[PDB]
Paper text:
P-glycoprotein (P-gp) is an ATP-dependent multi-drug transporter of the ATP-binding cassette (ABC) family that is involved in the active efflux of many drugs and xenobiotics from cells. Drugs and inhibitors are thought to bind to the inward-facing conformation of P-gp, which is more favored in the post hydrolytic or nucleotide-free conditions. The drug is then translocated across the plasma membrane by transition of the protein to the outward-facing state, which is more favored when ATP is bound. In P-gp the central aqueous cavity has been found to house the binding sites for transported drugs and inhibitors.
Numbering used by the authors: 33 to 626, 687 to 1271
The structure:
């Protein structure tokens, strides 16, 4: 059978009306050629009347009476014919929509009904085969996609074929010669599109690869930002970013030639094939057979059929997606095992049920998503035993609990029963005989008594009132309004843990159960209600058949037999007194267990007025490219005019002359004007996309502060804004020239053409164009005004579906199943009533959308008839009104297509505005006099408080003052690593101190030029920023006030010990490492990071964190570089593993932002405070 035979399944009239709607769609397709036919039929008659009026004419007014009487007699019969086709399309439109909404709805209601019930009759396999929430959500929307998968798309497919083949049958019958040419050009247009797609593709690939390099050049440089600021490499990296965008600017400009030429060639094939068909068509009259006038309008109906099949393709593509998501997951609705638990079957266990014995279990994990981790379990319980399990071990004991039901059934080992087996028996009785107590009861609610009744659906209030007492739930059912029928939200969203627990114990007791079973049930309770719950779980046991598991060895002694499970298998089996007399494994266990929505405006115009290269000739080009399109209709009007009303004189020469004019004027100009319009806005966008990207990336690379402290930013996410905004703003250029073009193809030429209308054709144009624009703008609202309300009826009906399965301990009561289906039988009924209603609404609006075609033709006939005919009827300008209506329909589509490409581009403008206005924290200041006498300085700190760029991370530095002298070490340690690290990272200016300040001596580092500061500061990175440059550059990523030379790369290699690598390899300083450093271990990377500080002679030096992940060589040969990098130069080092850096002339202990001890290392080893207490725990 077909896949669609399973979608359109069951029912009677539910299937039969699909045939009625299919027949309506066929007739609605055949009506479109018949509307073309009559305008042709009039053209045969008018080509006779009009030419006889120039050829053996009855004077020049008796023809205007005798011939015109027959024309208005005929037009009075035509007034029946086109009105009958009009009445037809109004009816079949509503019958087609009645199929789409009401016949589909007659299946889709029962499909949704049996879908919610199919989760319930999936019984066990719903737990294994994907997961709750999403499996319910995708299925809930995919059974909505089935509506299109059986609906309108199938109608549109048959309707377009009926227009196509119906038009072709008439076009063969009246003149197959031209109808064969319409077949022959279709593969040529398809081949042209088959070139256009390759031209669009294999230029964009290279534009993407050119940009991908500019992306990677931004990403690593922004991640490394404060280090690239400290080296000075911005003078290299800003041009690496620029030139990869110059390559993209060499590529996009060539696509802006080739794609525009390939579209112009497709337009040229259209103008040329139409012109050749017209000239061949009149040659098949004034020489030859199989033409007249009407045949041309018949051949145009075949082209309307090809357009109708084009309009069907997006509906067939939507139908392919409606096959898509729905038909595969339809197997989880049915073709699943579907019976697995025996949900409404089985004979009763009238051996009372109780006498279980598990044997040689090796079973699966629950849901089979994890492997069978359990190996070895055997376990007894018999009628008149509390068996208590000891040796608790999580999932490896919880499997034994979930195996107590038709939810998991053993395969790896067995259960044994003293009678008929528990896998075979009555599943409702099996749910209700046991009180199955989990610490968390995941349960749907509405009242407390209804939640208790979700244990067993047959109850009396006399059972309920005892159940709330003996579960000890009575305290809150006395405090709450309406008591046991007190109102509560879904999942119990107004109840604490111990309250839900005592309600779930009442939900057990109301069964009159014989057995108690406990999923570790003392765990996760509140310590008030844990005791009140234990007293309820003791009250729930009349000296009777129980299987208890708990973290408290109280309920384990409130019992009859211990069963011990150190790992797996039963190791001990005796009384709690016995295993404490004889002091076994139970006694061993007793000894341990007792985006920017404010879219911008105005400023955008002055910004683009600063960005753009003023190619204003593209505006003139868009105007003339628009005005050329109605000139096709002017020359075609002149062909119809001379052919209907010239008489025979010169006709073959007039047709040949107008053919030559038509072919040349459209083929030459339209190609050039589309090409030059596309190539002008393309080149404007090539400047804009490059110029914006350079300015915003340069702005980012001059503001880390107030943008990397943003928890709402991510480096790659900013690189997506660099991707998207610079492309969206490019689309926001060419679309505006397309809006200029369509205005001139429409009213900007159409009103000038109306200066030669006899007012009747102006009334015709004005009666149609705004009304068809209003119709589509209403049709929009009619559709969307259902869909939002349909979604909210479905959403409310979805909450009560997910609440039926996430609340999985409702499958452990199983009698609420058909009560949920009873809720769904009313809930699915409100959107189905909405669907029955909208079948009329869409019926009348889609019917009115046909009525405008009858009205258009009927007005065009009845505004020429009699009143213009008496003058001689206008053999011109009638065609121009229809072309202006087509340019009006084109205009509405062109303008509404670019509406989101206003809105998105105004959001991209808000993103661009934030980043061009910058953060003023890392710029070229000059209030502090830059003095050379203090490159090493005497760095003063005073009153200092600091909180990290992660802004919630507390003011961790708190009132500090310190100094470090010219050439001195200042080693820092402190109670949580923040007391040391913040002092380096504020001197980096990677954030400002919120109070206090820091000074080079008597002049402020908050006010010193950040690039002068970053000329004297060296900084050691935990990770070297790395593209595959030479080793020389992979030390020296630029310099802020120096010149890199042989001597500095010698010092930086030798002092940092990294010359171990550089003097060894091929090429020495020239050689390679790959992006991120393919052969660079931690020890090499930190020795490179030391070299990067040293290669500019750093008069002040900063060692951020004195080990990364280092040990052995990789640590001690790094310390052998740390000691060589400090001393004689003003060096701050934040001590980590104190068995790296303890060598310093001064150390300071910064406890929670204040000094607690200080001195040289040996003076602090004497101080028996914090420092010696931090040494005396490292070793
Ligand atoms: C916005 C909305 C409601 C989806 C809508 C819009 C239009 C436009 C804007 C193109 C008139 C249309 N129009 C069309 O699809 C068509 C417009 N002009 C034609 C001219 C000749 C042959 C077919 C069409 C056509 O299908 C239909 C709509 O349903």
């Amino acid at each position: 059978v077909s896949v669609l035979t399973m979608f359109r399944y069951a029912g009677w009239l539910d299937r039969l009306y699909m045939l009625v709607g299919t027949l309506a769609a066929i007739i609605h397709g055949v009506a479109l050629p018949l509307m073309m036919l009559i305008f042709g039929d009039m053209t045969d008659s008018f080509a006779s009347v009009g030419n006889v009026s120039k050829n053996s004419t009855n004077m020049s007014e008796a023809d205007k009476r005798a011939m015109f009487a027959k024309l208005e007699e005929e037009m009075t019969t035509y007034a029946y014919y086109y009105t009958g086709i009009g009445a037809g399309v109004l009816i079949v439109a509503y019958i087609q929509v009645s199929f789409w909404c009401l016949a589909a709805g007659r299946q889709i209601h029962k499909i949704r009904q049996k879908f919610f019930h199919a989760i319930m009759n999936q019984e066990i396999g719903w737990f294994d085969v994907h997961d709750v929430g999403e499996l319910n959500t995708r299925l809930t929307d995919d059974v909505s996609k089935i509506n299109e998968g059986i609906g309108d798309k199938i109608g549109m497919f048959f309707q377009a074929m009926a227009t196509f083949f119906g038009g072709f049958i008439i076009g063969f019958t009246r003149g197959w010669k031209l109808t064969l040419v319409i077949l022959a050009i279709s593969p040529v247009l398809g081949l042209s599109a088959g070139i256009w797609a390759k031209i669009l593709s294999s230029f964009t690939d290279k534009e993407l690869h050119a940009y991908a390099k500019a992306g990677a050049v931004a990403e690593e440089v922004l991640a490394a930002i404060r280090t690239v600021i400290a080296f000075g490499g911005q003078k290299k990296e800003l041009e690496r970013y620029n030139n990869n965008l110059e390559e993209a600017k060499r590529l996009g400009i060539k696509k802006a030639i080739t794609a525009n030429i390939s579209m112009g060639a497709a337009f040229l094939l259209i103008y040329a094939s139409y012109a050749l068909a017209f000239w061949y068509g009149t040659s098949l009259v004034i020489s030859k057979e199989y033409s007249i006038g009407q045949v041309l309008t018949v051949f145009f109906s075949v082209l309307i059929g090809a357009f109708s099949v084009g309009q069907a393709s997006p509906n067939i593509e939507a139908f392919a997606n409606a096959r898509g998501a729905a038909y595969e997951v339809f197997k989880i609705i049915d073709n699943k095992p579907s019976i697995d638990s025996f949900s409404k079957s089985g004979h009763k266990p009238d051996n009372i049920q109780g006498n279980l014995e598990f044997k040689n279990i090796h079973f699966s994990y629950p849901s089979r998503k994890e492997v069978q981790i359990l190996k070895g379990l055997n376990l007894k319980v018999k009628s008149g035993q509390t068996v208590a399990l000891v040796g608790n071990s999580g999932c490896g004991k919880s499997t034994t609990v979930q195996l107590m039901q038709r939810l998991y059934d053993p395969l790896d080992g067995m259960v044994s029963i003293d009678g008929q087996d528990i896998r075979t028996i009555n599943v409702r009785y099996l749910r209700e005989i046991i009180g199955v107590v989990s610490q968390e009861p995941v349960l749907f609610a509405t009242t407390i008594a209804e939640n208790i009744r979700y244990g067993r659906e047959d109850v009396t209030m006399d059972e309920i009132e005892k159940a709330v007492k003996e579960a000890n739930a009575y305290d809150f059912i006395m405090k709450l309004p309406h008591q046991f029928d007190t109102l509560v939200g879904e999942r119990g969203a107004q109840l604490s843990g111990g309250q839900k627990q005592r309600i779930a114990i009442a939900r057990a007791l109301v069964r009159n159960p014989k057995i108690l079973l406990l999923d570790e049930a003392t765990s996760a309770l509140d310590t008030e209600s844990e005791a009140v719950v234990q007293a309820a779980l003791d009250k729930a046991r009349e000296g009777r058949t129980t299987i208890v598991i708990a973290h408290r060895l109280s309920t384990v002694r409130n019992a009859d037999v211990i069963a011990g499970f150190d790992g797996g298998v039963i190791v001990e089996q005796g009384n709690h007194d016995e295993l404490m007399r004889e002091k076994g494994i139970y006694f061993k266990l007793v000894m341990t267990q007792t985006d920017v929505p404010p879219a911008s405006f105005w400023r955008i115009l002055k910004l683009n007025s600063t960005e753009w290269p003023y190619f204003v000739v593209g505006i003139f080009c868009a105007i003339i490219n628009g005005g050329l399109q109605p000139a096709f209709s002017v020359i075609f009007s002149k062909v119809v005019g001379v052919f209907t009303n010239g008489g025979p004189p010169e006709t073959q020469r007039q047709n040949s002359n107008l053919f030559s004019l038509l072919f040349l004027i459209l083929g030459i100009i339209s190609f050039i004007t589309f090409f030059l319009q596309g190539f002008t806005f393309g080149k404007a966008g090539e400047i804009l996309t490059k110029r914006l990207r350079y300015m915003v990336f340069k702005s980012m690379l001059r503001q880390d502060v107030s943008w990397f402290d943003d928890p709402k930013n991510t480096t790659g996410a900013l690189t997506t804004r660099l991707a998207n905004d610079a492309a969206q703003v490019k689309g926001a250029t060419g679309s505006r020239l397309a809006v200029i073009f369509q205005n001139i193809a429409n009213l900007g030429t159409g009103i000038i053409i109306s200066l030669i209308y006899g007012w009747q054709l102006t009334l015709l144009l004005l009666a149609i164009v705004p009304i068809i624009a209003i119709a589509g703008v209403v049709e929009m609202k009619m559709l969307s005004g259902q869909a939002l309300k349909d979604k909210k009826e479905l959403e409310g009906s979805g909450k009560i579906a997910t609440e039926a399965i996430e609340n999985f301990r409702t499958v452990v009561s199983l009698t609420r199943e058909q009560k949920f289906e009873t809720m769904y039988a009313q809930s699915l009924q409100i959107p189905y009533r909405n669907a029955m209603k909208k079948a009329h609404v869409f019926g009348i609006t889609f019917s009115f959308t046909q009525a405008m075609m009858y009205f258009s033709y009927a007005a065009c006939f009845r505004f020429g008839a009699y009143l213009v005919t008496q003058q001689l009827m206008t053999f011109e300008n009638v065609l121009l009104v229809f072309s202006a209506i087509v340019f009006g329909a084109m205009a509405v589509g062109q303008v509404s297509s670019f509406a989101p490409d206003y809105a998105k581009a105004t959001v991209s403008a808000s993103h661009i505005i934030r980043i061009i206005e910058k953060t003023p924290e890392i710029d070229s200041y000059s209030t502090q006099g830059l003095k050379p006498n203090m490159l090493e300085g005497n760095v003063q700190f005073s009153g200092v408080v600091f909180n990290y760029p992660t802004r919630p991370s507390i003011p961790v530095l708190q009132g500090l003052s310190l100094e470090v002298k010219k050439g001195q070490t200042l080693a820092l340690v402190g109670s949580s690593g923040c007391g040391k690290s913040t002092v380096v990272q504020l001197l980096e200016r990677f954030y400002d101190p919120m109070a206090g300040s820091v000074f080079l001596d008597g002049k402020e580092i908050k006010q010193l030029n950040v690039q002068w500061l970053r000329a004297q500061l060296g900084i050691v990175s935990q990770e070297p920023i790395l593209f595959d440059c030479s080793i020389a550059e992979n030390i020296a990523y630029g310099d802020n006030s120096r010149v890199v030379s042989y001597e500095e790369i010698v010092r930086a290699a030798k002092e940092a010990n990294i010359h171990q690598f550089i003097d060894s390899l091929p090429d020495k300083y020239n050689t390679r490492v790959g992006d991120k450093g393919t052969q660079l271990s931690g020890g090499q990377k930190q020795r490179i990071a030391i070299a990067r500080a040293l290669v500019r002679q750093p008069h002040i030096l900063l060692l951020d964190e004195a080990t990364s992940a280092l040990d052995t060589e990789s640590e001690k040969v790094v310390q052998e570089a740390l000691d060589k990098a400090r001393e004689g130069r003003t060096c701050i080092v934040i001590a980590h593993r104190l068995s790296t850096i303890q060598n310093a002339d001064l150390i300071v202990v910064i406890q929670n932002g204040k000094v607690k001890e200080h001195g040289t290392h040996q003076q602090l080893l004497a101080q028996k405070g914090i420092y010696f207490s931090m040494v005396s725990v490292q070793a």
